[PDB]
Amino acid sequence: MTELCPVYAPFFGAIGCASAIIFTSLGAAYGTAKSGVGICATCVLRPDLLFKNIVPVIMAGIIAIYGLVVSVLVCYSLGQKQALYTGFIQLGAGLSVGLSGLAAGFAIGIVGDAGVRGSSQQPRLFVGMILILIFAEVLGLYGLIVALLLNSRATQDVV
């Protein structure tokens, strides 16, 4: 009930922890769905590439790891009597990682679908597909990094 620690302060931390996994899971699901459509489309013609072309689905799932990591780390500083500064730090970290992971998952899904459909026809395109998928995943990595930077300040000098 303190001016520095309102009763609605835990709402921001809880909702940031929820969002960190919600948006990353949404992006990972979009990536997994699009890459699965691509893989199932290509495996009818080139079944030998079934296990090589699953990489987009794998890289879509790493976004979910980033969201889970941020959600786990946010719960560390969650509490009833936490400051509004800590709550908004948690919300900012959760929003950063969630939106970054959502964008990364969308990009991974689209580029992975394109790459799996274009690598069966041209095997030289697997390297390009992997490169662009890494470029899409490093965006979720950057969101993770910003979330970690915010979290490092969550419970420092807080009273």
Partner 1 sequence: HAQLSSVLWTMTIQIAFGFRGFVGVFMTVALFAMWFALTCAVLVLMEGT
Partner 2 sequence: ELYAIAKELDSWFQDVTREKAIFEILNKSNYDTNRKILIAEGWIPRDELATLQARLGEMIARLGIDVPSIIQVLDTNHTPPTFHRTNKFTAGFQSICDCYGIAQYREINAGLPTIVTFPFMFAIMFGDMGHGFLMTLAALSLVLNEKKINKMKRGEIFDMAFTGRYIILLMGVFSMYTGFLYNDIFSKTMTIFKSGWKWPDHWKKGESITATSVGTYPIGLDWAWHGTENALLFSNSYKMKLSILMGFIHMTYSYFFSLANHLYFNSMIDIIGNFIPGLLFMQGIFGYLSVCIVYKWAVDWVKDGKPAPGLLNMLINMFLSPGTIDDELYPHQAKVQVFLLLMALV
Partner 3 sequence: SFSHFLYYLVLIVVIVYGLYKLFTGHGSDINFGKFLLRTSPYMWANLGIALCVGLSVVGAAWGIFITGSSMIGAGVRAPRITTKNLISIIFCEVVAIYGLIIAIVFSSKLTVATAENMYSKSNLYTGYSLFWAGITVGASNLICGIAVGITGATAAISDAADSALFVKILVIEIFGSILGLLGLIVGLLMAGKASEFQ
Ligand X SMILES: CO/C1=C\C(C)=C\[C@@H](C)[C@@H](O)[C@H](C)C/C(C)=C/C=C/[C@H](OC)[C@@H]([C@@H](C)[C@@H](O)[C@H](C)[C@@]2(O)C[C@@H](O)[C@H](C)[C@@H](C(C)C)O2)OC1=O
First to last CA, the chain: 13
Instruction: Tokens 């520095």: give the residue.
Output: 4
Scanning 46-54, 65-73, 78-86 for contacts with partner 3 by CB under 8 A, the matching segment is: 78-86
To the nearest whole angstrom, how small is the minimum distance from the Cβ of residue 110 to ligand X? 19
- 62 is a site residue for partner 1 (CB under 8 A): yes
Size of the site for partner 1 (CB under 8 A): 10
Residue 139 makes contact with partner 1 by CB under 8 A: no
Distance in Å, CB of 136 to partner 1, minimum = 14
In this complex, which beta carbon is closest to partner 3, that of residue 68 or of residue 88?
A: 88
Asked if 127 interacts with partner 3 (CB under 8 A), we say yes
Query: Which span sits near partner 1 by CB under 8 A: 29-37, 59-67, 101-109, 118-126?
Result: 59-67
Instruction: Assess contact for 114 and 129: CB atoms under 8 A.
Output: yes
Q: Among residues 22 and 65, whose Cβ is nearest to partner 1? A: 65
How far is it, in rounded angstroms, from Cα 52 to Cα 61?
A: 16
Residue 36 contact among partner 3, partner 1, ligand X, none, beta carbon within 5 to 8 Å by kind: none
Would you tell me which residues interact with partner 2 (CB under 8 A)?
51-52, 123, 127, 148-149, 152, 155-156
Q: Binding to partner 1 by residue 54, rule CB under 8 A?
A: no
Classify burial at 13, counting beta carbons within 10 Å of its beta carbon; exposed 0-12, middle 13-18, buried 19 or more: buried
CB environment 72-99: b (16+ within 10 A), e (fewer): ebbeebbeeebbbbbbbbbbbbbbbbbb
Point out which residues bind ligand X (CB under 6 A).
51-52, 54-55, 58, 61-62, 64-65
DSSP class of residue 79 equals -
Question: CB 3: neighbour CB atoms within 10 A?
Answer: 7
